[PDB]
Amino acid sequence: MVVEVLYDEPIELLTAANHPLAAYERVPWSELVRYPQVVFKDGYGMQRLVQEKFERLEATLQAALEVNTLDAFRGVVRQGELIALLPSSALVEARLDPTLAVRPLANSALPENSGLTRRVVMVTTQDRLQIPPIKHFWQLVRENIPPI
DNA sequence: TGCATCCGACAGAAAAATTTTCCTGAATTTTGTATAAGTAGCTACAAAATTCTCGTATTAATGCGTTTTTTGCATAGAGAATATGCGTTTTTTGCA
Numbered sequence A: 001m002v003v004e005v006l007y008d009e010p011i012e013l014l015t016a017a018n019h020p021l022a023a024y025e026r027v028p029w030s031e032l033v034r035y036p037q038v039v040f041k042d043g044y045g046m047q048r049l050v051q052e053k054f055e056r057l058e059a060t061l062q063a064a065l066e067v068n069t070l071d072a073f074r075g076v077v078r079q080g081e082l083i084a085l086l087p088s089s090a091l092v093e094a095r096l097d098p099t100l101a102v103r104p105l106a107n108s109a110l111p112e113n114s115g116l117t118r119r120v121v122m123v124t125t126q127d128r129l130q131i132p133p134i135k136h137f138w139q140l141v142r143e144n145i146p147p148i
Numbered sequence B: 001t002g003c004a005t006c007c008g009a010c011a012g013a014a015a016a017a018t019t020t021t022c023c024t025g026a027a028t029t030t031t032g033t034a035t036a037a038g039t040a041g042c043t044a045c046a047a048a049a050t051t052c053t054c055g056t057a058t059t060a061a062t063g064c065g066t067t068t069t070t071t072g073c074a075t076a077g078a079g080a081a082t083a084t085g086c087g088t089t090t091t092t093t094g095c096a
Helices: A045-055 A070-075 A132-141
Strands: A005-007
Touching: none
Parallel strands: none
Antiparallel strands: none
16 A cells, blocks of 8 residues: 555635634634534545544534535635635635635644644555656655645 | 898639840940051261370478577565554543
């Protein structure tokens, strides 16, 4: 397997064209439930990690109502408000377009125990990485990953 | 001319009559006798074929010493796996 996590950005959330977490610029995870923080997919490991990442800052992951579609992540936040999961590395990109200029932030992430941030993880077999394409590039892509 | 009554055993003798059988024409269960035509086959003849055989020529068949080659051979690395390991963790004990 060669377990290999290129990096583990630390989680924040979607604040908004009106968020008061776009007032309250940080994101612990109470500050989520403060507005309608819908959690993502119970069962999908993606949230298993987020369960921490919303579950140790005055909040417990509330997988109430997630439409399981980014389009909808925006089709009620294009009204301006609604808030759910966009992690750190693209939480360079939470503040974007002219409905919305948003409050960025770092991880509150009391959830950690041992090592616990969600991890970008290229993991491989030599056969798989036995050629210039993936092997060197897959390495470079797991390498040239800036905040940009 | 109108009221009752009644009806619709036996025997002999000669002639006929059904079958039977040999004689006599009639023209068939048919089948018999010679001559001349004609219908079909036999003897003979034609040969250039075709094809059988011996010799030569090319070619395809068959074996090998060697080209590379495939597949079996060994020993070198790696990537966790597997200790120590604290160090952290879960287990286990007595008081209120």
